[model samples]
Target: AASCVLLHTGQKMPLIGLGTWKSEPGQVKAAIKYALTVGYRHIDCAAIFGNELEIGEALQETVGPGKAVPREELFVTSKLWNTKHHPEDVEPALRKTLADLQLEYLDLYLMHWPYAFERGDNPFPKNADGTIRYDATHYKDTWKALEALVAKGLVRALGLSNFSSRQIDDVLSVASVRPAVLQVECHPYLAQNELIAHCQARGLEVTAYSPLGSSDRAWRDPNEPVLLEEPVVQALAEKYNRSPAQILLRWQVQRKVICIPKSVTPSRIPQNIQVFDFTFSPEEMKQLDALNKNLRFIVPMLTVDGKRVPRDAGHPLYPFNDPY
Candidate 1:
């Protein structure tokens, strides 16, 4: 098992967890079960992933009354979809996720993104002009809605994902229940030094998604660089006598950045969490730090009228424009 961090909300979160981003329907069930059996107490999931039902089925055998793992012994995180960012849609959306995940409450629930999409049954609403349809409901209003859930006992803590520093403040400035975590993309190439420091200063724990650069992302450009293949990382792996992913994961946990690396390969899932046993030398940590090139791998994207477009490309609340 990995080490844990005590959040300001008085909850203990595992610094390493299983990510279920691209895990397929038929396979995610076994993947989750294997992960739990192998000592992963934290499961990072999102409503937008479209596989929560199967995940719930898998959890039935592991969690709850008289099960291998009790609900209190696990940290389950699910995200609020962009289409459900309106105040009215917040509660129902979480109810649906809770039903799909077969849980009475969630350990952590995050606003999937800083922006909102048009409210409707369609997950991806688009305009006739081949652009994503956006809703005017700001994130602060949605955050206020989520604060009520913690009081109602539906969510233990709330968090933000894919949000910029300024957007984070916009939510915090009006928050009654402060955000406990901020989930973002982090790896050697895009080290996110400034953003990590910014959130840490404000008492928000950071979680790194795609800690290995997400080479499996559907939108990945074949010619783009992969962090796992970097010579510096490979050389370090040889030096540490560990897998490249372990070296990268060690860098994250050492810097106090939580990581949730996704994988369905049974062997790799267990191998990824073995990072807790090792430590990087001070200079080796700096070597990995020097690999930062500010390269970002993926963004939220959707097809609008047969054309692919980034959801927040031209929106007023676009968070990627911020330097951090």
Candidate 2:
């Protein structure tokens, strides 16, 4: 089991969680069941993942009054989708997520992105021009709606995902219920040092989403460099007698950044959770830090089910434009 990060909201978020992105419904339910059985107390999810119903069934079976894991002992996280960014749509979106997950209250609910799309059922609404139908609704107003959820006891904490340094500052400036976490595309290649520093300075914890370069990312290009196969990672794995994935996760946890590596493979789940047992030296930590190329893999455009979607960079609220 991994150590916990004490969030500002006074809840302990597990430093490592089971990521549910890119996981098919056919495979995610069993993956959650297996992960819960093995020491994974944290489960990261999002409405856009489109597998919440199955995940909810798994949680319902394993966590509850008489179940193996108590509801209070687990930290669950789900995000608000682009279509649901409107202040009026916030509660319904969360209510739907809560109902689907079968949880009375969520441990954490995050704004999926700073960008907003057309308010509709489509998570990725496209215009006739093929670009995303960008909505001008400011995210700070949506933040207030999220804060109201906390007041209602529906969400334990609020967070921002895929937000830039300036964007985080904007939220902090207007936040009455301070944001507690920032989930982003962080890995060795995209070290996100500046963003992490800003978060730390402002008292927000960082969670690395694509902690292993998102090897199975929907938009992954085979020709691009692989994080898991990097020579430094492989060499460290050999030195520590661990897998490359474990080494990468170790680096993240060492930095005190939470990591959620998506692995439905039976053996890999247990292997990824084994990082807490090891310690890395300062020199070794810097060795991994030296691998930062600032190369980000996650983008608004995605290739899903073999179809490449248009980029949403045109959106005014797009957060990736800043250097961060």
Candidate 3:
């Protein structure tokens, strides 16, 4: 199992978790079971992935009597989808996830996105006058419902994802329960230093997804530079006698952010979790810090009433600016 961080709620969170984003149904089930066998104590999941049931099955099967992993040893996280952001739908959405995963309560739950669109619709929204629909009230109501989950004991912690600082402040302004975590994309190319500092300042734990640059995803350009091949990442890997992947994973760990690097390969599952053995030197850390290009591989393409969201809508994010 990876080491743990004490959350603001006095709960401990494993620094490294198994991520289940793009993994297919059969493959993700096997991967989660394998990850448990190999000492992974945390699992990061989202409803949008459409494989929560399979993950739940894997967990139930692996946690049998006298099994290698106990249920309490695992930290499971799930996200609230964009369509269910309305206040009345938050709990129901969570119930569906809970029933799908077969878990009574979640260790952590995230809002999934900052921008709110219409219900039952995909990320894209149709404009009322036959244009685009961009709505904000849904997000506020959704956050209020999320804050209420803590009181119901359905979720141990609430978090935000794909959210900007300004957006989070809006939620905080009316929130009775403050968010305890924030998950976003982080890698050598998109280091997200300012966002990390902002989250830390507010006492929110940050979780980094796509830690390996998500090279395998379709939306990612094949011609783009591989993070593992970068000179700075390679140099740090050599200094620590670790692979570039491990170096990148350790970089997030050193920053006190939880990281979920997704992998379905049997070899990669164990390989990804073997990052806790070494530490990066301060100089190496600083050198890696200089590699931030803030390039975002995926951008939300939601359309409301046939109008496309402004590309600049999400560009305020440091990494979205793509400084490199």
Clashing pairs counted in every model? 0, 0, 10
Per-residue error at 199 for model 1, in Å? Answer: 1.0
Q: Compute each candidate's TM-score over C-alphas.
A: 0.96, 0.96, 0.88
lDDT of 1 by residue, 1-324 (tens): 589888999999998999999897999999999998899999999999999999999999889888899889999999999999999999999999999999999999999988899998889888788677888888999999999999999999999999999999888898999999999999988888998889988899999999988866767555646788888889888987999998889899999899999999999999888898778889888899999998777775566797756657788888898787
What is the alpha-carbon RMSD of candidate 2 to the true structure? 2.5
What lDDT does the true structure give each of the candidates? 0.90, 0.90, 0.80
lDDT of 2 at 136: 79
- Inter-residue clash pairs, candidate 2: none
Clashing pairs in 1: none
Q: Can you write out model 2's per-residue Cα lDDT over 142-172, one digit (the tens) per residue?
A: 8999999999999999999999999999999
The TM-score, computed over Cα atoms with residue i paired to residue i, of candidate 1 is 0.96
Error of 3 at 77 (Å): 0.3
Better structure of 2 and 3 per lDDT: 2
For all the candidates, what are their Cα RMSDs to the real structure? 2.1, 2.5, 3.9
